[PDB]
Design a protein around this ligand. Structure first.
Ligand SMILES: C[C@H](C[C@@H](C[C@H](C[C@@H](C[C@@H](CCN1CCCC1=O)N1CCCC1=O)N1CCCC1=O)N1CCCC1=O)N1CCCC1=O)N1CCCC1=O
Ligand SMILES: Nc1ncnc2c1ncn2CCNC(=O)c1nc([C@@H]2CCCN2C(=O)OCc2ccccc2)[nH]c(=O)c1O
Ligand SMILES: [Mn+2]
Ligand SMILES: [Mn+2]
Length: 178
């Protein structure tokens, strides 16, 4: 598909590979479900830019690993620090703030997607941070974890991705797909 060719020429190959591994691990093929292929690559790159944000070895990346290794690291963090075991796999863990983080990249209002995630988690301790393709963000307790400059790069990157899809007339079908 055209979306697949764009995703592959838009994101770096390591990111594309982790999304491919993660989709086939859950029975989905990137060549058919090309919109979900785009969304996993975006979500992946955001998590890695996020993890790059802040100090050194600050975030233990949970997303991008296979399920059983990801839960292995979560169980170790839980028995290490003593925090509650979340019901759903998060994306990061903040060693500085001592909390798991769920990262979301949406095509709706940050309030709606935050509400969906906050009610589905129902763990209270897991921190939530939502980005949108228009530069908007919402985070638990208005605590945005990272500095402004790091968050602004993610927002800028998201909007750069949005324009690239639109130039290829793919942005409309992509938002009408989440
Ligand atoms: C050189 C640099 C590359 C990026 C790479 C890094 C992503 C992340 C990748 C993998 C680790 C790889 N695997 C495979 C299985 C076992 C395993 O461990 N996974 C997935 C699960 C968690 C994790 O770690 N990695 C690799 C090194 C450390 C790291 O976090 N990051 C982080 C920022 C955005 C990004 O892409 N790095 C490395 C550090 C700085 C940086 O940017 N380049 C080249 C030019 C463009 C670019 O970014
Ligand atoms: N089909 C599966 N493909 C890969 N990974 C999958 C997967 N099912 C489960 N996981 C791993 C655990 N879920 C997440 O980590 C996660 N989930 C969600 C939502 C909410 C409910 C399911 N979901 C979803 O699957 O699409 C989003 C998505 C996007 C990119 C990468 C993964 C997932 N939004 C997250 O921001 C997020 O990080
Ligand atoms: Mn995840
Ligand atoms: Mn997430």
């Amino acid at each position: 598909s055209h979306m697949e060719d764009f995703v592959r020429q838009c994101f770096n190959p390591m990111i594309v590979e982790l999304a491919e591994k993660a989709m086939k691990e859950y029975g989905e093929d990137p060549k058919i479900e090309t919109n979900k292929f785009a969304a996993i690559c975006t979500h992946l790159e955001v998590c890695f830019m996020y993890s790059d944000g802040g100090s050194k070895h600050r975030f233990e990346i949970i997303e991008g690993r296979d399920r059983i290794m990801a839960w292995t690291v979560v169980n170790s963090i839980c028995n290490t620090t003593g925090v509650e075991k979340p019901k759903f796999l998060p994306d990061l863990y903040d060693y500085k703030e001592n909390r798991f983080i769920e990262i979301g990249v949406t095509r709706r209002e940050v309030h709606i997607y935050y509400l969906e995630k906050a009610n589905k988690i129902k763990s209270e301790k897991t921190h939530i941070h939502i980005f949108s393709f228009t530069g908007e963000e919402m985070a638990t307790k208005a605590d945005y974890t990272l500095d402004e400059e790091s968050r602004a790069r993610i927002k800028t990157r998201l909007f750069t991705i949005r324009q690239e899809m639109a130039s290829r007339s793919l942005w409309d079908s992509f938002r009408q797909s989440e």
